Amino acid sequence: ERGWSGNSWGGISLGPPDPGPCGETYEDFDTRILEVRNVFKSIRVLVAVGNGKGAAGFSIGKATDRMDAFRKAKNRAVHHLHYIERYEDHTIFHDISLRFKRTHIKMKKQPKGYGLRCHRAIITICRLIGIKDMYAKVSGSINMLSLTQGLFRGLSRQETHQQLADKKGLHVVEIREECGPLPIVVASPRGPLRKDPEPEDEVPDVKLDWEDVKTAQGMKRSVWSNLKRAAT
Amino acid sequence: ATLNQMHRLGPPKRPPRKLGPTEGRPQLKGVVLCTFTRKPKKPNSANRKCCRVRLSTGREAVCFIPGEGHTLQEHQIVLVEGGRTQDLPGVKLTVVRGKYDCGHVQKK
Amino acid sequence: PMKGRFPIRRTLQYLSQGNVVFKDSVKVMTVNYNTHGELGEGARKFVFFNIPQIQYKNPWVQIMMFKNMTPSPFLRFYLDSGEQVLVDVETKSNKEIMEHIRKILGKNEETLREEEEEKKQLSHPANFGPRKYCLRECICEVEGQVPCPSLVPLPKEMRGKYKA
Amino acid sequence: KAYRGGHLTIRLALGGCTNRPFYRIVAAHNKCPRDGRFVEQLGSYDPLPNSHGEKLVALNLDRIRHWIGCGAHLSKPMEKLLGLAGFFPLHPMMITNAERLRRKRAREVLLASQK
RNA sequence: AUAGGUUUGGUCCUAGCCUUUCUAUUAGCUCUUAGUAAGAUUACACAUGCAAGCAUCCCCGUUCCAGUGAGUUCACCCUCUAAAUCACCACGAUCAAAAGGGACAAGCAUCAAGCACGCAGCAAUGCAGCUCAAAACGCUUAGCCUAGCCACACCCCCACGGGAAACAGCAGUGAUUAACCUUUAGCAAUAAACGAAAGUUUAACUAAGCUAUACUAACCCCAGGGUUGGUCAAUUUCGUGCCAGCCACCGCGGUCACACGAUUAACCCAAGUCAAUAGAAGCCGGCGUAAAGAGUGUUUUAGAUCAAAUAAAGCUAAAAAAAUAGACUACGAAAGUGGCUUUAACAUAUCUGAACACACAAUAGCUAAGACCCAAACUGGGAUUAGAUACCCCACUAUGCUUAGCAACAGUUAAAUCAACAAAACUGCUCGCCAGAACACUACGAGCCACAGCUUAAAACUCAAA
């Protein structure tokens, strides 16, 4: 099977990580190549690993031979694993806007069946993590290492519903249009519950993105948005 | 810029697109005035077959003749399309093979 | 991001959240308010948040604002008859001011629903025409009727080429 | 647009495709094109029998009465349709054509008997 | 945009160009059938035949329909009110002109002033006003806001008159363009005209003819076009050897060429393919080092919420400019201000906001005069190697001198500090400026001056970078 292109290393699987000197096996982990570069000769490889159940990581490996670089990167990646929280084990808990160096990433939580409409590297990393429904937009410099670092950083700093309930001492109630006006309580505080309601902010002072508002108002006209694509 | 500045300046005004050697037309008819060869710019070496043609618009222009072997002579009628010849600076018109006097490339 | 504080004010959805539709009598609304003083705070918010919505829902009403011309904020409405309505707005929040003006000079929900029902009659579902105005272009789109010859050829007996 | 004189008339505007006619009953200025600008659409008429063997005619009777009361004229096909609907009296020519067809069929029957 | 390729020895940033998607036209090659839709490049010139009649004479119609896109804010709403239809006694509805009010495309400010563009009075006449950097006035471009609308109808905007003899009605032709439908039939349906009516007429229209332009459905045998180095799916064997040739971008070709030609195989689409052209998709981003914020202060229509100075008089010690004080850091808008005395005297109770107004500032050079100890650009003379010393010495000019003149503001240190280096990061608000390189501190226009000029500031060609 080919990667992102016929002649591209990116997206290619390297197989499970080798059994570690600690004695752990990683047969449930898959490895993917994100970047291969000639260092002036040696090779620097950026790879990502993940078990598809929230545990995922990435690493750089430098070696004169490509296979040695792959092995080094994979083995070092398995020992630097992030755990990524997933809402209902298919998507993220909330929208995440981040900037790592000069790379900006906007991530949007999506319902089931939406799929991965993301940068191809983000699609690979999401498949490794176990995220199945998400939207992502990458802006600024498209630098692969910065993209990976920013993605992992933002995904590792997402607040779960239980965390929000404990912080605010209130019920987190979900409203679904497909479920009508039925209130679904997704999280309740473990401790006592505050009896005073949250201030009913008549107009919140949030920082909006012109991109989202322009799309919502129908003034987006891009011929490249919402194109039909293969299942991801 | 501030919102007041954006309001005063208004929407961006994209400059009009520049018309090319064909003047925004798919093809152009032309009369061959003379045939000659030109040398590429130098990472490359060759003798590119070119012809000067008076177009239907009245302008005289240099065009490249693609393929191996041509039988174009003076006073012959050709059809020229767009497309730059990357090796030849200033040559932005290409003769269409198999139209009017310019015949298709002979096999082998 | 969108420039300025409270960029949500510059979204059509917020602008359409407005619930004050003035009766046809109202021609001009002047808003006299003060830039400093706690007792005028709500009035300041009324200028910041609700005047855009009121103007959006009432495009033909002339809204004008005045600053630090009187010790107290107030609203004045000029009616077509020549009457003037004064609304004092000290100690009142912006929401309270909106409710007050809605009550005294705003069309009620019954009148608005009547207007929408009148608008509905203009687009008769039985008419056939372009998509911009009608649900269907032609009767052939109705099942049981003869469909387009473009999609289903007619039998030779119904074509003039075979009748002439 | 200002036309020299003219009047409103309720008539049939032809749409559909080749060998598949369909009609819209519209009130329009008589000088306007057949399928052009109109004042109001007052109904429709499908002259091809449907799967149930019916010719479907929709008539906005309230608006038809309104426009007749505002001075609108009627084309002969529209008068015949309204006569068939029972809204108007049967047009004299429906009766006369029926009588002519009766006489023609009588002549054909007499020819058959003579043979 | 879910993006991708391409600057370097290398990494990062910025930035252009191109790739992938969807349409339309034209071109090459190819092409079986059926239905449907659509169909001159040209406001250039037109052979020929038709496109308006009806009706007991009057009238009515031929002011419509049909056509084109040359010109171009007469199209929309409100007020008023003709003509028209029906009421037909109008009452009044419907429809809709002329007139009044409002609204109404794009580019260019190197189009910044227009030049009578207003008001009041019954009039006589009086006032001097009116539009405009929130874009007047002007030049250029374009049919538009598509159930359709506007404008035009050979030209002179118009059409008494003149040029002159009219297809922008249908079919058709010549010329021209890359652009190329039949010199068919019928009024059977609908629409229009006329008639009291049976009815009559209609190149509107209906039904056909031609055309891969498109959509739909097929097919009994019947497939072509492009592509195969990366982006980007997919090469075997020969030929050639920086030649012939090829490429959208990066690039290939010098005897093992997956990149040229042939051949084999494969890949994509498919009655099409896809070469050219043109559209579809563009700034809520930035301004120390990449394009873009270093003279100073005041006013300014509006917007915001942050309401040891200086000048003038005198005087002076060490030897005209002022040791110590001054290890002080004060005064002023900045430039700058450091001997002593005296007289005047150091704007403003919010902030932002002039190229165009007024003040300063520093910068050297000219115009009248005057002084001239000394110094000294230039100009002469003296001495010197073997193109002397450009350089040393002497003399003397202009001049040195003295008058008289020409990013700002207000908050925060909470966050993950943060491309890099600079100078730790950010917020709010306002103004100015910037959208690849070079052409170009340029040309032209305008303003100001005027020996040299200063401010504003383009376009063509070229490139894949900078």
Ligand code: FES
């Ligand atoms: S649109 Fe009605 S027959 Fe085709």
Ligand SMILES: [K+]
């Ligand atoms: K008559």
Ligand SMILES: [K+]
């Ligand atoms: K036009």
Ligand SMILES: [K+]
């Ligand atoms: K004219």
Ligand SMILES: [K+]
């Ligand atoms: K007929």
Ligand SMILES: [Mg+2]
């Ligand atoms: Mg490949």
Ligand SMILES: [Mg+2]
């Ligand atoms: Mg790029």
Ligand SMILES: [Mg+2]
């Ligand atoms: Mg073709």
Ligand SMILES: [Mg+2]
């Ligand atoms: Mg016609």
Ligand SMILES: [Mg+2]
């Ligand atoms: Mg009248």
Ligand SMILES: [Mg+2]
């Ligand atoms: Mg009018």
Ligand SMILES: [Mg+2]
């Ligand atoms: Mg035009």
Ligand SMILES: [Mg+2]
């Ligand atoms: Mg003509």
Ligand SMILES: [Mg+2]
């Ligand atoms: Mg004329």
Ligand SMILES: [Mg+2]
């Ligand atoms: Mg013709």
Ligand SMILES: [Mg+2]
């Ligand atoms: Mg054509």
